[PDB]
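Internal ticket #5521
Category: modeling
Description: The requester needs a full-assembly model to guide mutagenesis choices. All entity lines are attached below as received. Residue total reported by intake: 1432.
Assigned to: D.W.
Attached entities:
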Amino acid sequence: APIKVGINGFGRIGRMVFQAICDQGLIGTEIDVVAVVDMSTNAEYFAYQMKHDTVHGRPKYTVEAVKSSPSVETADVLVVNGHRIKCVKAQRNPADLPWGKLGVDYVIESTGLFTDKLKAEGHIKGGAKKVVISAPASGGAKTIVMGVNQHEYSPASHHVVSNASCTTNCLAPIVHVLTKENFGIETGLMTTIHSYTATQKTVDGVSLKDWRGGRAAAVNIIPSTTGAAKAVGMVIPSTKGKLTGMSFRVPTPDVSVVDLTFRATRDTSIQEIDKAIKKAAQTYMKGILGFTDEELVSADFINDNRSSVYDSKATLQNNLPGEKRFFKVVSWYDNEWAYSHRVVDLVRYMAAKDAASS
Amino acid sequence: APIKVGINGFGRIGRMVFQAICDQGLIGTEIDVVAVVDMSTNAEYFAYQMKHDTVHGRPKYTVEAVKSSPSVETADVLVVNGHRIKCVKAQRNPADLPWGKLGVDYVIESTGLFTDKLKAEGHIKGGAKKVVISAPASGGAKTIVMGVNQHEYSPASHHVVSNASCTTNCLAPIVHVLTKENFGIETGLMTTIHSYTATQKTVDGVSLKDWRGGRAAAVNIIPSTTGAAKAVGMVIPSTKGKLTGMSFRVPTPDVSVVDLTFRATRDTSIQEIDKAIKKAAQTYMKGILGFTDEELVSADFINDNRSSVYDSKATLQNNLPGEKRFFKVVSWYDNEWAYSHRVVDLVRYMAAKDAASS
Amino acid sequence: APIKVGINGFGRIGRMVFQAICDQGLIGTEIDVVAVVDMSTNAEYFAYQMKHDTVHGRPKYTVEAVKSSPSVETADVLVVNGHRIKCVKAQRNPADLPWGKLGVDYVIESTGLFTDKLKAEGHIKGGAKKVVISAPASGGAKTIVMGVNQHEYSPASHHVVSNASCTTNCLAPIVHVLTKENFGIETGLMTTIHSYTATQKTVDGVSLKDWRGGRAAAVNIIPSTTGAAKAVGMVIPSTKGKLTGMSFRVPTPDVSVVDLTFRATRDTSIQEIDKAIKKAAQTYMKGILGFTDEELVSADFINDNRSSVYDSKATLQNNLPGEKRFFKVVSWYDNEWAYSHRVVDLVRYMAAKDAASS
Amino acid sequence: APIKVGINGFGRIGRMVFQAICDQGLIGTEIDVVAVVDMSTNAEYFAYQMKHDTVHGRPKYTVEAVKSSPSVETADVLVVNGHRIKCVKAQRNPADLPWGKLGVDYVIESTGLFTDKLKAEGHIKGGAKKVVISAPASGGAKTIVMGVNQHEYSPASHHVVSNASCTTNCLAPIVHVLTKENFGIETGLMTTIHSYTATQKTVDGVSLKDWRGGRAAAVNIIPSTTGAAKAVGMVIPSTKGKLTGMSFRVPTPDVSVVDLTFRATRDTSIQEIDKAIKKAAQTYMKGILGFTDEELVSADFINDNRSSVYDSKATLQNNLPGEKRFFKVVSWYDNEWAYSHRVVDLVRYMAAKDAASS
Ligand SMILES: COc1cc(OC)cc(C(=O)N[C@@H]2[C@H](O)[C@@H](CO)O[C@H]2n2cnc3c(NCc4cccc5ccccc45)ncnc32)c1
Ligand SMILES: COc1cc(OC)cc(C(=O)N[C@@H]2[C@H](O)[C@@H](CO)O[C@H]2n2cnc3c(NCc4cccc5ccccc45)ncnc32)c1
Ligand SMILES: COc1cc(OC)cc(C(=O)N[C@@H]2[C@H](O)[C@@H](CO)O[C@H]2n2cnc3c(NCc4cccc5ccccc45)ncnc32)c1
Ligand SMILES: COc1cc(OC)cc(C(=O)N[C@@H]2[C@H](O)[C@@H](CO)O[C@H]2n2cnc3c(NCc4cccc5ccccc45)ncnc32)c1
């Protein structure tokens, strides 16, 4: 029984998510992407965008654009590895979307305009069963981070779920084992050296909400606030009010790194922490949290699908010799690639669980 | 009698133009910028943007934001070197602008939405007397390139003028001395290595009109088209249908270079062309066309206000040993800074001539 | 009978060449890289450099560093896909290299210090049979561009061959078909928008020979001279003194594009030229010269091994409507990747022909 | 009595220092730069390098290259604002420099090859009096940070002084007031997002000592270690073994930022710390420690000569709501410009004190 999904909003996020599905070879067999929705239905343009990625290169699958009817002037259907995907026109209100008419049960909300629990529900009123917001959510939506708290998903209570953010998906895993392995965490501050994103400007532009955010992105180091710190508090309750952090947008199109500085509950050492993270990466966190012993740089993590990949050498070489409480942990993450795979993982999980409970 | 001007659209272009007025020390004495119009009237945000520029640095003048009335919650008035500038709320149709009520005679149209002669004329219906479009125009608007054909401006015939484009303001000067010095020009192809601009995207985004133009700007070499070639045909009629060119957008926030390859009418040499350009730069083109004998790079032309600055070394060293017809000329230009000064020079010219003819 | 090859100089060029060999799955079976020579014999460092590449990503083969004798402190042997490569200490004079002692017949001279025919011959005096300079040569060394004039290679006369440069390998193929298909070429000027290289500096630095070439590389458009223009005159005699060109180094780590402007001998059209290049690419130039009908950017050519891939849309869209003589041709090239594959192709060709003639 | 100074090593650092002098308008009157030493004496090249800077732009003073004798083929004398500066030939051993013969008392060691106390003393053996190493020093040399411990300079005991590093000159000031204002500092970890430098590579290159540091600089986030953390322990004794930090080299040619995370001794608040830093910046730290309330970005600090400029907004907005011990402090610094001005200030301080004690 292929999971009927729909993607509302086919921008960087949307496409990435779709590509992640196709990349995992789930298209057709496991997941059926009935359709994608956006301000345009020009399938030829979508194929172009999918076939060529500045950062992620060429896809391992075949993409072609065709016409639903030999009547239509411009393609409106996408064909990935044979499977057919419908390019549907966008709506101002999610409830106006023909989800029920199309047979879509799970809608991936990635337009960034419906991050509010109430507004997102519109998809269900449109005929959808479940909605997964590919970004932080507001309005009391269940936030989940694969590898940290997916077990808290309630098929009967949760209908609008949030996959949090890319940064949160990198920090939470670390914080998760730090607390689970009973290392404790009195308080902590994290800084993320983050690659610039679509919301930024090429040259100095307009940004009334975020003044710094409007400055030339690939020529500046741009400070910015982030909720990934507090958000982890929702996935890991015990950390509420103990964690906070900021971001530094820098001249890279993709891949970011987390720098966590925290104080432990009981005396320990950087070595202990090191081994515990590695051990977790090889056991209950495999696939989500990984690690490296190599002298790597951002470029080396492109297309790495782990939500968080711990940098052992960087960590061990930059802590106090015999410190027992104050530590710094460094973990990388492909802010685009990994997050996308997590959205897929979240959907498959929910679907598998929604079916199990019947 | 200070020229009463109004800037419609206060983005990069609008500000740069305004900064060029201030930088030239014309604010107040020579030019009276009665007001600027944008979707926002937040003078504090405008002050911020003017006081800090990634590429051009800090201004040589003082900029402060004040309140028209102590009642207003957020500053709506800009104070540059004592002169007061009004921050007015934008309108959908230029004709609704209170130009006449503000006493504005010359309007600088730089929103990018009224490049059409018919739409731009709305400012005049709004009360303005003359309009200068800070970009290429359509609908039969007189196009002028200072130092090439300002003498063709007709106070009684032209009311909506276009200052052309940055690139055109770089090529025209060259082509102008090439034809004036009777070198001739059978045909010519020009390629411009241009810095990326506001219309581009930080990361792969949406660009239906220009597909390549949607790719990550600071990380790719992006081919694009340019009308600068044909436009020079309107400023210099003799070149109609003889010129054409293309552009390559590269990873630089500012400063571009023009690579002109053309075939001369009569036998000559690159040394001849070289001496001529330098001669013209020192005489009838001074201030508009300049040149350099130094081993410079793009950064070296930041804040250079000449529309086009000829590169002697680069030219002399890259032509055929004894060629007599087929040549290549290289000239730099600060695509932001110079163009901005030109808009100011055009306004001052129009104003002086409008007044002279009474 | 595995070709015995030795790499002198294991820098960007040398490694790329090596990776090209391994990538083509030639390591061991077809080509035996007996050893690589450099200022360091630290195999662990070389492994690191080969296992991680900022631009080309991770290798498809396995690389491991081991010790020749359990005695040595630091590994001095590289093991790729099982094959053992010796890491040998560099020498001031190539004649001091143990080529004969190692059984090396073909030496890849890529240190950039022995581009002179006389100095390169030192390898032969050292025991080697043939020398391939992975760069433009001087001193009368035979220059060869695969796909254009490899047939002119003489196993008895040519012992020190030059693969030319990346730029020459992109332009020659084009020029080759232009002349072969009898399009003619009175004169021609080419400009290459080239990615920065190892010879450049991160921040303004020292470069007595090339003043401009010493300025911050990733933040400037840096003009420079190129011999790729004249060099094509040696591979395609008929073009001697007819071609010339220049380069513009821009802020990209890899991939460049050639902008060729030329005047044909007989009347023709850009469409004729377009179809001809596409035909040549699909026939006698397949593998060397390719083409594209897509709206691509530099990043799309990363890892493309064709010496030159013609841009059809960019070319057709930027030429004069009904021009018959003056044209512009656009072709891209992964200046690093493709050139490397050519070096390997040159070597295999030579080796096959040296054996045949006996 | 003009301070007789000599610059050994005229690279980025050297020039910067020399330009700092001229910029301050000290050249000639206060400081007499008798000469500069480097592998080359080509004054014309030096003038070029000084008249054009990718990051800092054009100089406010005039630079010209002349010949000591109308005999010499290439200029060997620099003429800034009239003052004459000799361009001397470099030596392998500092003791072989004609410092005594030239009348140079204070030598600025900025070659990076003589950071060792013992080797640097060679300048004094060459006839010099005092030596200032424009970089961290080893061998037990007195390290001083203007605004933090210049008073600890002993004219009779210290003959080889170290101005520390750019990063240390940024963190020290902050830590200084943190301790002086009795906020206390149990332990502290600092991360510095640093622009790339001359030691890095444009494309993946050779770097045996620092493997990651060899990777393409302007296209990666590169982790690295830094002694700036421990170094503050020598300038501020009470901080020994309490501080430690790391660095992240990002794609920016200049300007860096410090992210300090520390635990205080007694209960306090971020607001307290904020007001304290500002107070200190207006009083005893003026000229060394500055601050901003604006939404700035890296580019906004170019040409800022303060050793450290505290970011109040960034700081206040990214700490825990009611935290009393665990805090984060952010401060920018033009790693090139500021440090250079400090070197000059150190020299003027030492000279004024050397003379005072007689
Ligand atoms: C690729 O094709 C194009 C072409 C285009 O230009 C016309 C814009 C976009 C674009 O913005 N594309 C957006 C971008 O790629 C991504 C947001 O991160 O999702 C897209 N997007 C934005 N709004 C969307 C929507 N409903 C909202 C909506 C629908 C109808 C009217 C509205 C009026 C006011 C405010 C909202 C309105 N439904 C689906 N995708 C959306 C995409
Ligand atoms: C700096 O402050 C802000 C804040 C903001 O968001 C709230 C948007 C902008 C912005 O877009 N800023 C634009 C940008 O800075 C610059 C274009 O290069 O001009 C601005 N701009 C956009 N439209 C403008 C206009 N009339 C058009 C117009 C007026 C009224 C309603 C309209 C409805 C639909 C379509 C057009 C409408 N008049 C003047 N400046 C304008 C600037
Ligand atoms: C990773 O290993 C390292 C370490 C290093 O630092 C010490 C430098 C390099 C490096 O420059 N590496 C260079 C770089 O990778 C590449 C040139 O693009 O070739 C390397 N290279 C430079 N000279 C070489 C040589 N013989 C010349 C030579 C050898 C011995 C003495 C000489 C004295 C004077 C003049 C020439 C001398 N043989 C092999 N590779 C060479 C490589
Ligand atoms: C423009 O002028 C040029 C030209 C050049 O190439 C020809 C190299 C440089 C350059 O490297 N320039 C170096 C660079 O700009 C900076 C160090 O970061 O200082 C320069 N530098 C390096 N060594 C120097 C020295 N004595 C040391 C020395 C002197 C003589 C021989 C030595 C042999 C082995 C080891 C050390 C040797 N004295 C002054 N400046 C120096 C500068």
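Resolution: model delivered.
Comment from assignee: Residues 2-164+336-355 of chain C form a domain with the Rossmann fold fold (CATH 3.40.50.720).
Ticket closed.
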